[PDB]
Amino acid sequence: MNYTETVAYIHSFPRLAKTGDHRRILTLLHALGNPQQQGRYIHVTGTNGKGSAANAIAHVLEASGLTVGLYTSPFIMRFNERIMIDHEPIPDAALVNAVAFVRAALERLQQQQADFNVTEFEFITALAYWYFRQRQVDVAVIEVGIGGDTDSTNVITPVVSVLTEVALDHQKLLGHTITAIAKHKAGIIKRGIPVVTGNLVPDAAAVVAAKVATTGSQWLRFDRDFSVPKAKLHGWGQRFTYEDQDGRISDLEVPLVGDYQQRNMAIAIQTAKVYAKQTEWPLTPQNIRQGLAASHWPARLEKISDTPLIVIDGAHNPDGINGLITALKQLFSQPITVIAGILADKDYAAMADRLTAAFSTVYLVPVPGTRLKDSWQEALAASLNDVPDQPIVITGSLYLASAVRQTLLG
Ligand SMILES: Nc1ncnc2c1ncn2[C@@H]1O[C@H](COP(=O)(O)OP(=O)(O)CP(=O)(O)OP(=O)(O)O)[C@@H](O)[C@H]1O
Ligand SMILES: [Mg+2]
Ligand SMILES: [Mg+2]
Protein backbone atom coordinates (compact mmCIF):
# COMPACT_ATOMS: atom_id res chain seq x y z
CA MET A 1 0.00 0.00 0.00
CA ASN A 2 0.99 3.57 -0.74
CA TYR A 3 0.51 6.48 1.72
CA THR A 4 -3.02 7.42 0.70
CA GLU A 5 -4.24 3.81 0.82
CA THR A 6 -2.45 3.28 4.15
CA VAL A 7 -4.28 6.18 5.78
CA ALA A 8 -7.58 5.00 4.26
CA TYR A 9 -6.73 1.57 5.72
CA ILE A 10 -6.25 3.04 9.19
CA HIS A 11 -9.69 4.80 8.90
CA SER A 12 -11.42 1.59 7.85
CA PHE A 13 -11.21 -0.09 11.27
CA PRO A 14 -14.42 -1.17 13.10
CA ARG A 15 -15.96 0.38 16.21
CA LEU A 16 -15.90 -2.52 18.65
CA ALA A 17 -17.52 -2.95 22.07
CA LYS A 18 -15.75 -1.21 24.94
CA THR A 19 -14.41 -3.97 27.24
CA GLY A 20 -11.94 -1.71 29.13
CA ASP A 21 -9.67 -4.64 30.01
CA HIS A 22 -7.38 -3.81 27.05
CA ARG A 23 -7.28 -7.42 25.85
CA ARG A 24 -7.57 -6.54 22.17
CA ILE A 25 -4.70 -4.04 22.09
CA LEU A 26 -2.61 -6.20 24.45
CA THR A 27 -3.03 -9.02 21.97
CA LEU A 28 -1.87 -6.89 19.07
CA LEU A 29 0.94 -5.40 21.17
CA HIS A 30 2.18 -8.80 22.23
CA ALA A 31 2.52 -9.73 18.57
CA LEU A 32 4.52 -6.53 18.12
CA GLY A 33 6.94 -7.62 20.80
CA ASN A 34 5.41 -5.62 23.68
CA PRO A 35 7.00 -2.21 22.85
CA GLN A 36 4.77 -0.58 25.51
CA GLN A 37 6.76 -2.39 28.21
CA GLN A 38 10.06 -0.92 27.08
CA GLY A 39 11.38 2.58 27.36
CA ARG A 40 9.90 5.43 29.41
CA TYR A 41 6.64 7.35 29.38
CA ILE A 42 4.75 10.42 30.56
CA HIS A 43 0.97 9.79 30.63
CA VAL A 44 -1.35 12.77 30.23
CA THR A 45 -5.06 12.94 30.89
CA GLY A 46 -7.69 15.54 31.77
CA THR A 47 -10.93 17.01 30.45
CA ASN A 48 -9.32 20.04 28.76
CA GLY A 49 -5.65 20.90 28.23
CA LYS A 50 -4.17 17.44 27.63
CA GLY A 51 -2.66 18.26 24.27
CA SER A 52 -1.37 21.73 25.16
CA ALA A 53 0.27 20.29 28.28
CA ALA A 54 1.63 17.23 26.43
CA ASN A 55 2.96 19.41 23.61
CA ALA A 56 4.88 21.67 26.02
CA ILE A 57 6.25 18.84 28.18
CA ALA A 58 7.70 17.37 24.96
CA HIS A 59 9.18 20.76 23.90
CA VAL A 60 10.87 21.29 27.29
CA LEU A 61 12.37 17.79 27.45
CA GLU A 62 13.40 18.12 23.79
CA ALA A 63 15.15 21.40 24.61
CA SER A 64 17.13 19.59 27.34
CA GLY A 65 18.54 17.17 24.72
CA LEU A 66 16.21 14.16 24.89
CA THR A 67 14.61 12.44 21.85
CA VAL A 68 10.88 12.57 22.53
CA GLY A 69 7.90 10.73 21.12
CA LEU A 70 4.63 12.64 21.30
CA TYR A 71 1.29 10.91 20.81
CA THR A 72 -1.69 13.23 20.60
CA SER A 73 -5.18 13.53 19.09
CA PRO A 74 -6.95 14.71 17.12
CA PHE A 75 -4.75 15.69 14.17
CA ILE A 76 -5.36 19.22 12.91
CA MET A 77 -3.94 19.44 9.36
CA ARG A 78 -2.98 15.84 8.61
CA PHE A 79 -2.95 12.36 10.16
CA ASN A 80 0.86 12.09 10.59
CA GLU A 81 0.67 14.72 13.38
CA ARG A 82 -0.62 12.05 15.73
CA ILE A 83 2.80 10.44 16.09
CA MET A 84 5.74 12.84 16.36
CA ILE A 85 9.37 12.43 17.36
CA ASP A 86 11.12 15.65 18.37
CA HIS A 87 8.00 17.29 16.91
CA GLU A 88 8.36 15.91 13.40
CA PRO A 89 5.24 13.97 12.31
CA ILE A 90 5.95 10.43 11.22
CA PRO A 91 7.19 10.59 7.57
CA ASP A 92 4.70 9.35 4.94
CA ALA A 93 7.04 6.55 3.85
CA ALA A 94 7.68 5.55 7.46
CA LEU A 95 3.94 5.39 8.17
CA VAL A 96 3.48 3.16 5.13
CA ASN A 97 6.12 0.73 6.40
CA ALA A 98 4.76 0.90 9.96
CA VAL A 99 1.16 0.26 8.88
CA ALA A 100 2.45 -2.72 6.86
CA PHE A 101 4.33 -4.20 9.83
CA VAL A 102 1.33 -3.91 12.17
CA ARG A 103 -1.08 -5.15 9.46
CA ALA A 104 1.11 -8.20 8.89
CA ALA A 105 1.13 -9.01 12.65
CA LEU A 106 -2.63 -8.40 12.79
CA GLU A 107 -3.04 -10.82 9.90
CA ARG A 108 -1.05 -13.54 11.70
CA LEU A 109 -3.32 -13.09 14.73
CA GLN A 110 -6.44 -13.44 12.60
CA GLN A 111 -5.04 -16.57 10.99
CA GLN A 112 -4.82 -18.06 14.49
CA GLN A 113 -8.04 -16.46 15.90
CA ALA A 114 -10.50 -16.15 13.02
CA ASP A 115 -12.65 -13.36 14.47
CA PHE A 116 -9.97 -11.24 16.13
CA ASN A 117 -9.84 -7.50 15.50
CA VAL A 118 -8.99 -4.08 16.87
CA THR A 119 -10.51 -0.59 16.76
CA GLU A 120 -8.98 2.27 14.82
CA PHE A 121 -7.57 3.90 17.96
CA GLU A 122 -6.22 0.52 19.13
CA PHE A 123 -4.38 -0.01 15.87
CA ILE A 124 -2.89 3.49 15.92
CA THR A 125 -1.84 3.29 19.57
CA ALA A 126 -0.10 -0.05 19.10
CA LEU A 127 1.62 1.28 15.95
CA ALA A 128 2.69 4.40 17.89
CA TYR A 129 4.13 2.38 20.81
CA TRP A 130 5.98 0.14 18.35
CA TYR A 131 7.23 3.14 16.37
CA PHE A 132 8.55 4.94 19.47
CA ARG A 133 10.56 1.84 20.43
CA GLN A 134 11.82 1.24 16.88
CA ARG A 135 13.21 4.79 16.90
CA GLN A 136 14.37 4.25 20.51
CA VAL A 137 13.05 7.53 21.87
CA ASP A 138 14.22 8.40 25.41
CA VAL A 139 10.64 9.03 26.43
CA ALA A 140 7.17 9.08 24.90
CA VAL A 141 4.56 11.63 25.99
CA ILE A 142 1.22 9.88 25.69
CA GLU A 143 -2.10 11.72 25.52
CA VAL A 144 -5.01 9.59 26.73
CA GLY A 145 -7.79 9.32 24.12
CA ILE A 146 -10.74 9.48 26.60
CA GLY A 147 -10.98 8.85 30.36
CA GLY A 148 -7.94 7.19 31.89
CA ASP A 149 -8.28 3.67 33.28
CA THR A 150 -10.02 2.15 30.23
CA ASP A 151 -8.26 4.08 27.48
CA SER A 152 -6.39 1.98 24.90
CA THR A 153 -3.21 3.83 25.86
CA ASN A 154 -3.38 2.58 29.45
CA VAL A 155 -1.06 -0.37 29.09
CA ILE A 156 2.08 1.42 30.31
CA THR A 157 3.84 2.35 33.55
CA PRO A 158 5.03 5.95 33.23
CA VAL A 159 7.71 7.94 35.03
CA VAL A 160 5.05 10.54 35.81
CA SER A 161 1.27 10.97 35.33
CA VAL A 162 -0.56 14.20 34.60
CA LEU A 163 -4.20 15.07 35.19
CA THR A 164 -4.74 18.63 33.96
CA GLU A 165 -8.31 19.12 35.05
CA VAL A 166 -11.69 17.49 35.65
CA ALA A 167 -14.89 19.06 34.26
CA LEU A 168 -18.14 17.57 32.94
CA ASP A 169 -17.68 16.15 29.38
CA HIS A 170 -18.09 12.63 27.85
CA GLN A 171 -20.85 11.51 30.28
CA LYS A 172 -22.20 8.46 28.37
CA LEU A 173 -18.66 7.14 28.74
CA LEU A 174 -17.00 8.50 31.92
CA GLY A 175 -19.86 9.42 34.27
CA HIS A 176 -22.53 12.05 35.05
CA THR A 177 -20.83 13.60 38.11
CA ILE A 178 -17.33 15.12 38.62
CA THR A 179 -16.64 12.36 41.16
CA ALA A 180 -17.44 9.69 38.59
CA ILE A 181 -15.40 11.30 35.80
CA ALA A 182 -12.60 11.95 38.29
CA LYS A 183 -12.37 8.28 39.31
CA HIS A 184 -11.86 7.35 35.66
CA LYS A 185 -9.09 9.88 35.18
CA ALA A 186 -7.34 8.92 38.43
CA GLY A 187 -6.92 5.46 36.87
CA ILE A 188 -3.67 6.54 35.17
CA ILE A 189 -2.12 7.13 38.59
CA LYS A 190 0.12 4.15 39.38
CA ARG A 191 1.89 2.78 42.48
CA GLY A 192 4.76 5.02 43.57
CA ILE A 193 4.48 7.15 40.42
CA PRO A 194 4.24 10.91 40.88
CA VAL A 195 1.20 12.72 39.54
CA VAL A 196 1.07 16.38 38.55
CA THR A 197 -2.36 18.00 38.42
CA GLY A 198 -4.06 21.31 37.79
CA ASN A 199 -6.13 23.11 40.47
CA LEU A 200 -8.99 20.61 40.88
CA VAL A 201 -12.48 21.43 42.10
CA PRO A 202 -13.06 19.97 45.59
CA ASP A 203 -14.92 16.83 44.50
CA ALA A 204 -12.16 15.89 42.11
CA ALA A 205 -9.42 16.79 44.61
CA ALA A 206 -10.90 14.31 47.07
CA VAL A 207 -10.91 11.48 44.55
CA VAL A 208 -7.25 12.18 43.74
CA ALA A 209 -6.14 12.55 47.36
CA ALA A 210 -7.82 9.21 47.99
CA LYS A 211 -6.04 7.59 45.05
CA VAL A 212 -2.55 8.93 45.89
CA ALA A 213 -3.10 7.63 49.42
CA THR A 214 -3.57 4.12 48.00
CA THR A 215 -0.73 4.39 45.46
CA GLY A 216 1.59 6.36 47.73
CA SER A 217 2.29 8.69 44.77
CA GLN A 218 3.88 12.11 45.30
CA TRP A 219 1.21 14.64 44.31
CA LEU A 220 2.06 18.09 42.96
CA ARG A 221 -0.96 20.37 42.50
CA PHE A 222 -1.20 23.74 40.72
CA ASP A 223 -1.57 26.54 43.35
CA ARG A 224 -0.15 24.43 46.08
CA ASP A 225 3.27 23.21 44.96
CA PHE A 226 3.77 25.19 41.78
CA SER A 227 2.12 28.28 40.30
CA VAL A 228 2.07 31.29 37.95
CA PRO A 229 2.21 34.38 40.21
CA LYS A 230 2.59 36.83 37.32
CA ALA A 231 1.58 36.92 33.68
CA LYS A 232 0.64 39.34 30.94
CA LEU A 233 -0.11 39.43 27.22
CA HIS A 234 2.89 39.88 24.95
CA GLY A 235 1.77 39.91 21.35
CA TRP A 236 -0.36 36.90 20.47
CA GLY A 237 1.16 35.19 23.45
CA GLN A 238 1.95 35.53 27.12
CA ARG A 239 4.94 36.34 29.28
CA PHE A 240 4.77 34.79 32.74
CA THR A 241 6.64 33.66 35.83
CA TYR A 242 6.66 30.05 37.08
CA GLU A 243 7.24 29.17 40.72
CA ASP A 244 7.54 25.88 42.55
CA GLN A 245 9.41 24.45 45.55
CA ASP A 246 12.71 25.25 43.84
CA GLY A 247 12.03 28.89 43.21
CA ARG A 248 10.95 31.01 40.26
CA ILE A 249 11.75 31.03 36.58
CA SER A 250 11.01 34.55 35.37
CA ASP A 251 10.35 35.99 31.95
CA LEU A 252 9.03 32.79 30.40
CA GLU A 253 7.10 33.20 27.14
CA VAL A 254 4.63 30.98 25.30
CA PRO A 255 3.07 31.77 21.88
CA LEU A 256 -0.39 30.97 23.30
CA VAL A 257 -3.16 33.22 24.67
CA GLY A 258 -5.81 32.29 27.22
CA ASP A 259 -5.29 32.43 30.98
CA TYR A 260 -5.88 28.70 31.27
CA GLN A 261 -2.72 28.07 29.21
CA GLN A 262 -0.69 29.48 32.14
CA ARG A 263 -2.02 26.44 34.00
CA ASN A 264 -1.35 23.98 31.20
CA MET A 265 2.20 25.34 30.85
CA ALA A 266 2.90 25.32 34.61
CA ILE A 267 1.72 21.72 34.68
CA ALA A 268 4.04 20.94 31.76
CA ILE A 269 7.01 22.58 33.51
CA GLN A 270 6.42 20.86 36.85
CA THR A 271 5.93 17.57 35.01
CA ALA A 272 9.16 17.85 33.02
CA LYS A 273 11.08 18.72 36.20
CA VAL A 274 9.66 15.65 37.92
CA TYR A 275 10.64 13.55 34.89
CA ALA A 276 14.20 14.87 34.88
CA LYS A 277 14.47 14.24 38.59
CA GLN A 278 13.07 10.71 38.56
CA THR A 279 15.51 9.87 35.78
CA GLU A 280 18.48 11.79 37.13
CA TRP A 281 18.55 13.94 33.96
CA PRO A 282 19.71 17.60 33.76
CA LEU A 283 17.04 20.27 33.16
CA THR A 284 17.89 24.00 33.17
CA PRO A 285 15.70 27.12 33.24
CA GLN A 286 17.23 27.82 29.82
CA ASN A 287 15.91 24.44 28.52
CA ILE A 288 12.43 25.28 29.89
CA ARG A 289 12.40 28.82 28.48
CA GLN A 290 13.43 27.53 25.08
CA GLY A 291 10.83 24.77 25.02
CA LEU A 292 7.98 27.09 26.06
CA ALA A 293 9.00 29.56 23.41
CA ALA A 294 8.61 26.79 20.80
CA SER A 295 5.31 25.57 22.18
CA HIS A 296 3.12 26.41 19.17
CA TRP A 297 -0.18 24.51 19.16
CA PRO A 298 -2.62 24.99 16.24
CA ALA A 299 -6.37 25.53 16.68
CA ARG A 300 -5.90 26.73 20.28
CA LEU A 301 -7.07 30.37 20.30
CA GLU A 302 -5.24 30.71 17.03
CA LYS A 303 -5.59 33.80 14.90
CA ILE A 304 -5.46 32.42 11.36
CA SER A 305 -6.54 35.53 9.42
CA ASP A 306 -6.00 39.25 10.01
CA THR A 307 -8.40 40.76 7.50
CA PRO A 308 -10.94 39.59 8.30
CA LEU A 309 -9.87 38.85 11.85
CA ILE A 310 -10.56 35.09 12.40
CA VAL A 311 -9.63 33.02 15.44
CA ILE A 312 -10.29 29.31 15.79
CA ASP A 313 -10.54 27.31 19.02
CA GLY A 314 -11.54 23.87 20.21
CA ALA A 315 -13.73 24.83 23.16
CA HIS A 316 -16.88 22.75 23.09
CA ASN A 317 -17.71 21.60 26.67
CA PRO A 318 -18.95 24.11 29.28
CA ASP A 319 -15.56 24.46 31.00
CA GLY A 320 -13.83 25.25 27.74
CA ILE A 321 -16.68 27.60 26.83
CA ASN A 322 -16.15 29.35 30.15
CA GLY A 323 -12.42 29.57 29.50
CA LEU A 324 -13.08 30.82 26.02
CA ILE A 325 -15.36 33.64 27.12
CA THR A 326 -13.00 34.84 29.82
CA ALA A 327 -10.19 34.86 27.24
CA LEU A 328 -12.09 36.57 24.43
CA LYS A 329 -13.14 39.18 27.02
CA GLN A 330 -9.45 39.97 27.67
CA LEU A 331 -8.47 39.75 23.97
CA PHE A 332 -11.16 41.98 22.47
CA SER A 333 -12.61 45.25 23.63
CA GLN A 334 -15.02 45.46 20.68
CA PRO A 335 -18.10 43.53 19.44
CA ILE A 336 -17.27 40.13 18.03
CA THR A 337 -19.09 37.29 16.36
CA VAL A 338 -18.82 33.73 17.64
CA ILE A 339 -19.73 30.77 15.45
CA ALA A 340 -20.17 27.68 17.63
CA GLY A 341 -20.51 24.04 16.54
CA ILE A 342 -21.97 22.97 19.90
CA LEU A 343 -25.12 21.55 18.37
CA ALA A 344 -23.66 18.18 19.70
CA ASP A 345 -23.71 17.98 23.56
CA LYS A 346 -26.91 18.34 25.55
CA ASP A 347 -24.55 20.68 27.16
CA TYR A 348 -25.33 22.72 24.09
CA ALA A 349 -28.27 24.97 25.37
CA ALA A 350 -26.54 26.24 28.48
CA MET A 351 -23.30 26.92 26.65
CA ALA A 352 -25.18 28.89 24.04
CA ASP A 353 -26.98 30.92 26.75
CA ARG A 354 -23.51 31.76 28.08
CA LEU A 355 -22.21 32.76 24.63
CA THR A 356 -25.20 34.85 23.53
CA ALA A 357 -25.18 36.32 27.05
CA ALA A 358 -21.61 37.51 26.58
CA PHE A 359 -21.17 38.34 22.90
CA SER A 360 -22.73 40.52 20.26
CA THR A 361 -23.44 37.97 17.51
CA VAL A 362 -23.58 34.16 17.97
CA TYR A 363 -24.25 31.55 15.30
CA LEU A 364 -24.80 27.87 16.06
CA VAL A 365 -23.78 25.28 13.52
CA PRO A 366 -23.31 21.48 13.21
CA VAL A 367 -19.87 19.86 13.09
CA PRO A 368 -18.61 18.63 9.70
CA GLY A 369 -19.31 14.88 9.86
CA THR A 370 -21.78 14.91 12.76
CA ARG A 371 -28.51 31.96 15.18
CA LEU A 372 -28.87 28.56 13.63
CA LYS A 373 -26.96 28.11 10.37
CA ASP A 374 -26.49 24.88 8.43
CA SER A 375 -22.68 25.04 8.31
CA TRP A 376 -19.83 27.21 9.58
CA GLN A 377 -19.22 28.42 6.01
CA GLU A 378 -22.76 29.84 5.98
CA ALA A 379 -22.39 31.49 9.36
CA LEU A 380 -19.10 33.08 8.33
CA ALA A 381 -20.58 34.43 5.13
CA ALA A 382 -23.47 35.73 7.23
CA SER A 383 -21.14 37.50 9.68
CA LEU A 384 -18.96 39.11 7.01
CA ASN A 385 -22.11 40.55 5.47
CA ASP A 386 -24.21 41.65 8.39
CA VAL A 387 -21.48 42.47 10.90
CA PRO A 388 -18.39 43.25 8.78
CA ASP A 389 -16.83 45.22 11.65
CA GLN A 390 -16.85 42.17 13.92
CA PRO A 391 -13.90 39.82 14.23
CA ILE A 392 -15.00 36.15 14.00
CA VAL A 393 -14.18 33.42 16.54
CA ILE A 394 -14.99 29.89 15.37
CA THR A 395 -15.22 27.30 18.18
CA GLY A 396 -16.45 23.77 18.87
CA SER A 397 -14.69 20.40 18.88
CA LEU A 398 -11.17 20.55 17.38
CA TYR A 399 -12.75 18.78 14.38
CA LEU A 400 -14.57 21.96 13.43
CA ALA A 401 -11.48 24.11 14.10
CA SER A 402 -9.45 21.64 12.05
CA ALA A 403 -11.90 21.65 9.12
CA VAL A 404 -11.77 25.46 9.18
CA ARG A 405 -7.96 25.58 9.34
CA GLN A 406 -7.57 23.03 6.55
CA THR A 407 -10.01 25.02 4.41
CA LEU A 408 -8.59 28.49 5.01
CA LEU A 409 -4.92 27.59 5.26
CA GLY A 410 -4.13 24.17 3.82
N1 LIG B 1 -6.81 24.36 31.23
C2 LIG B 1 -7.87 24.61 30.44
N3 LIG B 1 -9.00 25.18 30.95
C4 LIG B 1 -10.06 25.43 30.15
N5 LIG B 1 -10.16 25.17 28.82
C6 LIG B 1 -9.00 24.59 28.33
C7 LIG B 1 -7.84 24.29 29.05
N8 LIG B 1 -6.88 23.74 28.26
C9 LIG B 1 -7.47 23.70 27.09
N10 LIG B 1 -8.76 24.19 27.04
C11 LIG B 1 -9.73 24.26 25.88
O12 LIG B 1 -9.61 23.02 25.12
C13 LIG B 1 -9.26 23.29 23.74
C14 LIG B 1 -8.30 22.23 23.28
O15 LIG B 1 -7.13 22.19 24.15
P16 LIG B 1 -6.18 20.90 24.14
O17 LIG B 1 -5.82 20.49 22.76
O18 LIG B 1 -5.06 21.15 25.07
O19 LIG B 1 -7.28 19.94 24.64
P20 LIG B 1 -7.36 18.42 24.86
O21 LIG B 1 -6.12 17.78 24.32
O22 LIG B 1 -7.84 18.09 26.24
C23 LIG B 1 -8.61 18.14 23.61
P24 LIG B 1 -9.36 16.66 23.03
O25 LIG B 1 -10.13 16.04 24.16
O26 LIG B 1 -8.15 15.86 22.59
O27 LIG B 1 -10.25 17.16 21.76
P28 LIG B 1 -11.77 17.53 21.31
O29 LIG B 1 -12.50 17.65 22.63
O30 LIG B 1 -11.74 18.83 20.52
O31 LIG B 1 -12.31 16.41 20.44
C32 LIG B 1 -8.67 24.66 23.74
O33 LIG B 1 -8.83 25.23 22.43
C34 LIG B 1 -9.45 25.36 24.81
O35 LIG B 1 -10.75 25.76 24.34
MG1 LIG C 1 -12.49 16.23 24.33
MG1 LIG D 1 -6.13 16.53 22.39
Q: Residue 97: CA atoms inside 13 Å, Cβ hemisphere, count?
A: 8
Q: Is 187 in the pocket of ligand 1 (CB under 6 A)?
A: no
For residue 72, how many other CB atoms are within 10 A of its CB? 23
Q: Which residues surround ligand 3, an ion (CB under 5 A)?
A: 51
**Nearest Cα residue to atom 26 of ligand 1:** 73
249 C-alpha vs ligand 3 centroid, how far in Å? 27
- Using the Cα atoms of residue 99, residue 104, residue 109 and residue 110 in order, give the sign of their dihedral: positive
- DSSP letters along 300-311, please? SSEEEETTTTEE
Q: Is 169 in the pocket of ligand 1 (CB under 6 A)?
A: no
Annotated binding residue 354: no
**Which ligand has the minimum distance to the alpha carbon of residue 318?**
1
Ligand 1 atom index nearest CA of 398? 30
- Cβ atoms of 157 and 193 closer than 8 Å: yes
Cited resolution, angstroms: 1.9
Strand 195-197 with 219-221, pairing: parallel
**What is the rounded CA–CA span in Å between residue 154 and residue 175?**
18
Annotated binding residue 323: no
Ligand 1 atom index nearest CA of 320? 5
For residue 30, how many other CB atoms are within 10 A of its CB? 14
351 C-alpha vs ligand 2 centroid, how far in Å? 15
- Cβ atoms of 98 and 124 closer than 8 Å: no
Q: Residue 78: CA atoms inside 13 Å, Cβ hemisphere, count?
A: 14
In CATH terms, the superfamily for domain 299-410 is Mur ligase, C-terminal domain (3.90.190.20)
Q: In what order do the strands lie in the sheet with 160-163?
A: 88-89, 83-85, 68-71, 139-143, 41-45, 160-163, 195-197, 219-221
**What is the rounded CA–CA span in Å between residue 271 and residue 142?**
13
The domain segmentation of the chain, as residue ranges, is 1-298, 299-410
Annotated binding residue 232: no
State the CATH class of domain 1-298: alpha beta
**What is the rounded CA–CA span in Å between residue 172 and residue 341?**
20
Experimentally determined by: X-ray
Q: Is 138 in the pocket of ligand 1 (CB under 6 A)?
A: no
Q: Is 165 in the pocket of ligand 1 (CB under 6 A)?
A: yes
